[PDB]
């Protein structure tokens, strides 16, 4: 017959066959279900889309049309949610979000 990719069937963008292979080859368990790759692909797709949206907003705010690690760092640290998710992670070439203790400022 004619092939219908699982990514097309589920309506996602991320691969589902590749995720299935990774589950079956990383020996996480003896047998993987048939909806687990789809669920995992959807979750990864959602997280990627959300962080990319924040990064693009930051890039526009910086008058640039290309995401960079600094923009990723700003997107992650500026919201209290991806900051907690990516707590221990150090994004290379990220820098720090700027703040100065109010005590240090002059009169």
């Amino acid at each position: 017959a004619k092939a219908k990719t699982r990514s097309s069937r589920a309506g996602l963008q991320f691969p589902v066959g590749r995720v299935h292979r990774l589950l079956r080859k990383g020996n996480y368990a003896e047998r993987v279900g048939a909806g687990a790759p789809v669920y995992l692909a959807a979750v990864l797709e959602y997280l990627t889309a959300e962080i990319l949206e924040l990064a693009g907003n930051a890039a526009r705010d910086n008058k640039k049309t290309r995401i960079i690690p600094r923009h990723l760092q700003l997107a992650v640290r500026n919201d209290e949610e991806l900051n907690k998710l990516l707590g221990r992670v150090t994004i290379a070439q990220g820098g720090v979000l700027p703040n100065i203790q109010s005590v240090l400022l002059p009169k």
Binding site: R6, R9, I68, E81
Partner: protein, 93 residues
């Protein structure tokens, strides 16, 4: 010399949220590493959950609970909603 990667897929995702912006290569590597890290975290937690309950299989129930138990609150809400709708669409179609 074939190295699997998520660059094509994250680029397809990017080109529908912000249909005009681009992305540098170093940022692309950072995103690929981020996706690998999240995948590994969720898969490992689901494996441990399956081991705890004597189940020998991983399925959508373990993936959903691993998501709801790793992502913080409000983010996990949307993550599980989207995962469920994708799975229902796959099963129906």
């Amino acid at each position: 010399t074939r190295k699997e990667s998520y660059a094509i897929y994250v680029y397809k995702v990017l080109k529908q949220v912000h249909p005009d912006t681009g992305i540098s290569s170093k940022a692309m590597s950072i995103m690929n590493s981020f996706v690998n890290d999240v995948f590994e975290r969720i898969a490992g937690e689901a494996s441990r959950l399956a081991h705890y309950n004597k189940r020998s299989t991983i399925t959508s129930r373990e993936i959903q609970t691993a998501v709801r138990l790793l992502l913080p609150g409000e983010l996990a809400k949307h993550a599980v909603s989207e995962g469920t709708k994708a799975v229902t669409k796959y099963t129906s179609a």
